[PDB]
Amino acid sequence: ALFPALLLALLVIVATALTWMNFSQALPRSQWAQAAWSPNINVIEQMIFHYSLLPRLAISLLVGAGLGLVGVLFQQVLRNPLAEPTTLGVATGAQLGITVTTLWAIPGAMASQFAALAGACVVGLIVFGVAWGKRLSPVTLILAGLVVSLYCGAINQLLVIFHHDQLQSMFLWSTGTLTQTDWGGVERLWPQLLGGVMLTLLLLRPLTLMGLDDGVARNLGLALSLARLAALSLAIVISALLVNAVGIIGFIGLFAPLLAKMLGARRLLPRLMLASLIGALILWLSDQIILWLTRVWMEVSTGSVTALIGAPLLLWLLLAFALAGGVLLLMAVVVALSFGRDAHGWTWASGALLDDLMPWRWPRIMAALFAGVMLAVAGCIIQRLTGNPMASPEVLGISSGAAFGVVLMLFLVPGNAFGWLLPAGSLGAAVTLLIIMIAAGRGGFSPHRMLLAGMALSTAFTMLLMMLQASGDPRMAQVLTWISGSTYNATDAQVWRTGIVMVILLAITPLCRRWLTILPLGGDTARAVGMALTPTRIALLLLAACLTATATMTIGPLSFVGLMAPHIARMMGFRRTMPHIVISALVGGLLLVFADWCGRMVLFPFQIPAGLLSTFIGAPYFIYLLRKQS
Amino acid sequence: TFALRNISFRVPGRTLLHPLSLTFPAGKVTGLIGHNGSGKSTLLKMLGRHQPPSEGEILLDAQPLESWSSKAFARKVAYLPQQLPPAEGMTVRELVAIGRYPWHGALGRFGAADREKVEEAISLVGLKPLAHRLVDSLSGGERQRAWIAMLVAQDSRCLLLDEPTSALDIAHQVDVLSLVHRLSQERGLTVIAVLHDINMAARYCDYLVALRGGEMIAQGTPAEIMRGETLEMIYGIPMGILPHPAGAAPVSFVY
Amino acid sequence: TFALRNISFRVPGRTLLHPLSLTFPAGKVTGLIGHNGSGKSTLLKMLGRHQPPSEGEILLDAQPLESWSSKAFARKVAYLPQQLPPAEGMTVRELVAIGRYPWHGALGRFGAADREKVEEAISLVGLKPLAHRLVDSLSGGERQRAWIAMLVAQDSRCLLLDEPTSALDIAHQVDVLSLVHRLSQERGLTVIAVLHDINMAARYCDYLVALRGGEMIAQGTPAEIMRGETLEMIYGIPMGILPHPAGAAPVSFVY
Amino acid sequence: AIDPNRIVALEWLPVELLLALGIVPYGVADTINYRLWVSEPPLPDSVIDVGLRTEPNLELLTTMRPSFMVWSAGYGPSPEMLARIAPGRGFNFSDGKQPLAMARKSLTEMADLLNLQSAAETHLAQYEDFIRSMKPRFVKRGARPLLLTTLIDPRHMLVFGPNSLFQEILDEYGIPNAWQGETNFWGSTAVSIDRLAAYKDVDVLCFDHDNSKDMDALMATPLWQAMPFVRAGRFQRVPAVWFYGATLSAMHFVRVLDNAIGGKA
């Protein structure tokens, strides 16, 4: 226990030294007591911005404590060791509120209200289901949370694609600058945070039971449904207040409870207090480093830097055949309609107009189909080799790594970094992709730690994208479409090449049928059967990585279809390797073809990327399937 | 003091499903035996209120049929999960203290008494150290004994054990059965235990009942039921029985 | 048949270390009996290459060291691990095609050439006319038979099983032990089975090995194992032994 | 292009150049946001909207017969997909130092391509005359630094750096820029409010575009009231102009500066 205590003492002394240095550079020490304690500070300019420098420290400490609290609560309620407030949709709902109240007037505390609304809607959809009883479970809870998070993310993406010049403020709000100009934020957060800690001190034994198994929790007589609903509502409310105070953060509440448990604290309230203190300390460190940076070079955000410095720390501390023929015929006829049907007056290509519009339709639809099929196969393979329902193509780090490379290229060099000879562009994206894949493979030996590293790298990519969008970069829109997975740059030659790659990969796939069959229900039994665990697990990971690589090379970094097609194929009633594979592939292909046709035709002038329409079509049907089997 | 009338376990088809009706003793030891979960599991799962009674009524000490307050319910019965051992825990003392949940409630007034009961529990189970390091660091027997200590501190009128004998050693089975029998003699509470081994139920239970699929075969005292001609129709294998000077109940051996 | 000369143990887990020395018979049943944390489970996990030993090494076949290829190891050893079990197989009758992996391999399998092996396996494990018409969620009696189906389809030279008798009834355990003994008598197979029950294991064994504390206690035939001193030393409780009226192994009874 | 009536533009800066030349645009990508932001050059209502600036609808383009599909070099579709529909050219506009220079260069290029050199010469002459006309209106103020800001939220502000589009106007008028810190290649940086406290004798000019409530929430705080540039009477609100424009946006900015600080000292 010497190492955690020594690290904590080092963090405290570094925070104190940085705060002393910043406060002395801002104001001489001989005028500190006259500036802090006096409610009517002197009119001196050097002494009056202490009205803004002091609230930044207080808001940082309070938000760190709140982050630790919500991390502990999300760890206990969902019974998962990892906290995930953003995946629950509280951050995305708050962003949606900010972007819908930034336009059409109607202002106020939009983040908290809309995040609470999203939480209440999720609670209602889970309690409803198909039976009078709620029958809520953590797995379906997290699934629905991810679904609504992706849905609000897609609505926000549509709103910024149609209006990006008028949401720059929102961009800053999505970076967590926590820059304060008065005491209003602290005076509004401290009473609500006091109410939060008061409600946390109460109902502690329900939290202890929620941390244990649900069986003994219902045995002890705790209303598991009502208690879990109330705890989730409290967590969503506190997270909404925090993201209304500062905004999107670098998951300090994901390091606070783990450090508090590594240091010690067997009981619950000591662990809560230590987690809050450690979160406040991390936010203090990050805020002081950001202040020093803006004093010496560039005004960068706080949450993005927090995530960028926490990622390496986390890496260091780490009927079938008939249904198939039916969906294939459906895809064939729907491709025929998308070729024939148009949007300029809803005309139909009767022949002569077909070859004139074919060079702008056939490549796009074919690329969307190939990308959907390949993403569905990759997602199914990942969920089969891992076994977790939350597994997505982003788990590898392929899409997040490629986008990281593109945004790094846009940051390092100015100008048209997409097609410039001096700029790397595709080559830079590819080399950063390979580097990110190698790092994710070397960091996590087990699929679960690899999943954690992939989620961390995805959050880091999101933070870098929000950094790129916060600044007035004229290119932030262009790459945005590429982030949204648009089939607009598809070419006949690229279509031919990705089709050849797809048929090669789908011919290699049946050779992995035995592996994809034994790895399920495996572990030690798989090794006892006669197959090598790691030499085949790395092989399947490389196959899925190549699939995702060509998918992002075709359509771009999107993984909603790759996450949804396996789930929908499993909920249809297909649970055999090759049947599930082909069904998920065909479902994803038809879904992405429908999404492309919608994004190209539902609005004739404005073309929305297919990645947004994929979500817009999959989310309602998926929540319908979830309620039908809840 | 429980009287069960189970016409249907569940609408969807189970391996075997048949109606039955029986009254449990007031202060004796009840031993439910059967072939795995083929009808035997549903009985105690429905008693634990994890399974709907379909078209049958269950008298809670002659109070009502169903839909009773969960607080008094947990204060009345103490149920053990059926081959679902809790994999979470930190301290044995923390566990046996949190076992006293349904007495003080969520906003519990634990700052007063309730310490003598947890002390008596941790002294009865045989654990000399009051608070160990980690409830998961101990062996399986010790953590299961801590679970029994939690169920003791719960202060229940009925003790439902769903297969405590399973995944345990024979000597551990004997020790746990003797402890449960001495506990039932001490507190005068009804205990219903699920036992895979017939001899184990013959040893430390005063009223054995058997369901071969769910038709209610035989109920009786070990002296009343003749195992020789009964276990042959109970489990199929024509095993024999012979007296032993160790226990008053003659031991059964596979033929 | 492989033999062990290793000294290592579960040093990091529960802090235990003790030297081991044992040579298994050529083609006889080997019953591992003792406590749960006695070391028999860790011994079988060491035998199945679940984790590399820290000291010593297990010599196999008398001609090679521990370093063996996966398809060559599984071609001579079939491991029933019980713990971390294959849950939700989602397919029936195809499990024998999964077990046949080390024979046909991934390439050149020809969709399982010579299908006489799989049908012989599913017919000798049990006369079932319901093949390719089952679901994954069934009772233990058929689940264990489906488990041993692929192990028989492997026709590996050794069968290492830990706790087949667990979660099963006396009839199903009788069936499983009779199948194992018939396999060992017909194919001359070397089987090492872990069973908690002393008498049930001894009735279908020949060379029992008892583990207590950290080391091994005995290694004799069931006739010499039935002695009361050995049972007292390996189980703690004092039990007695008396000749069986018709069973080959005498009956042991707890006091 | 022989017919100037069917010219199509894919970015707002080509539209501004076309309106400066006097050519009537036939199709503009994203015209609603254009009419919302840019307001100095009146865009007609009969202009057919093509779609997004980054993803112009190709089927709508091929439906009509465009004679020249001018676009911004490095923004929009690939050059081959645009040359497959109609012959055109990608014009450079931004580099990180002199945006207005290359704006004028691309204007002259568009003139030489569409055979409109006389219109471009007349437009540049009128621009230079309008610039020289407002020269004595900014000489009596002296060498006091001017600060170009815009409100993002009641906590930050977007400040124009030494490489903005309004820097050639400031340099020609002998007006040094007040911001002398960090800067990006497009001429805008998001800084904090308290950082502006480091500037004493500066003439902060802030633009407004649907942010009156944020302005009130900012000026209601005592920290903003105690700022050095407001206590000396140097902060005034002026109508917003288009930052990333060309010559017409420059004329609008010059007129705004003349109505603001023109003839103060």
Residue numbers in the entry:
A (entry chain B): 6 to 323, 348 to 659
B (entry chain U), C (entry chain C): 11 to 265
D (entry chain D): 32 to 296
Q: What text comes from the article?
A:
As one of the most elegant biological processes developed in bacteria, the siderophore-mediated iron uptake demands the action of specific ATP-binding cassette (ABC) importers. In the periplasm, a group of soluble proteins named periplasmic substrate-binding proteins (SBP) are generally responsible for binding the siderophore-Fe3+ molecules and delivering them to corresponding inner membrane importers. In this study, we functionally characterized the ferrichrome, a hydroxamate-type siderophore molecule, importer FhuCDB complex from E. coli and determined its structure at 3.4 Å resolution by single-particle cryo-electron microscopy (cryo-EM).
To understand the molecular basis of this importer, we determined the structure of FhuCDB in LMNG by single-particle cryo-EM at 3.4 Å resolution. The overall size of the complex was ~130 × 100 × 80 Å3, with one FhuD on the periplasmic side, one FhuB in the membrane, and two FhuC on the cytosolic side. However, a unique feature in FhuCDB was the single membrane subunit of FhuB, comparing to two subunits of homodimers in other known subfamily members. FhuB had 20 transmembrane helices (TM) folding into two domains: N-half with the first ten TMs and C-half with the last ten TMs. In between the two halves, there was a central translocation pathway. Based on a tunnel calculation using the MoleOnline server, the FhuB central pathway was open to the cytosolic side and closed to the periplasmic side, indicating an inward-open conformation. The movement of these residues effectively deformed the original substrate-binding pocket in FhuD and allowed it to be occupied by two loops from FhuB: L5 in between TM5 and H5a as well as L15 in between TM15 and H15a. In FhuCDB, three residues in L5 (F167, D170, Q171) were directly interacting with FhuD residues (N64, W68) via hydrogen bonding. Specifically, these four residues: V165, F176 on the N-half and their counterparts Q498, L509 on the C-half, defined the narrowest position in the pathway, which was then directly closed on top by H169 and M505. Below the periplasmic gate, residues along the path could be grouped into three types: hydrophobic residues with mostly small side chains (A96, G150, L151, L155, G158, A159, L494, I512), polar residues (T91, T92, T97, Q100, S154, N161, Q162, S179, S421, E423, S487, T488, T491, S513) capable of forming hydrogen bonds, as well as Met residues (M175, M495, M492, M484).
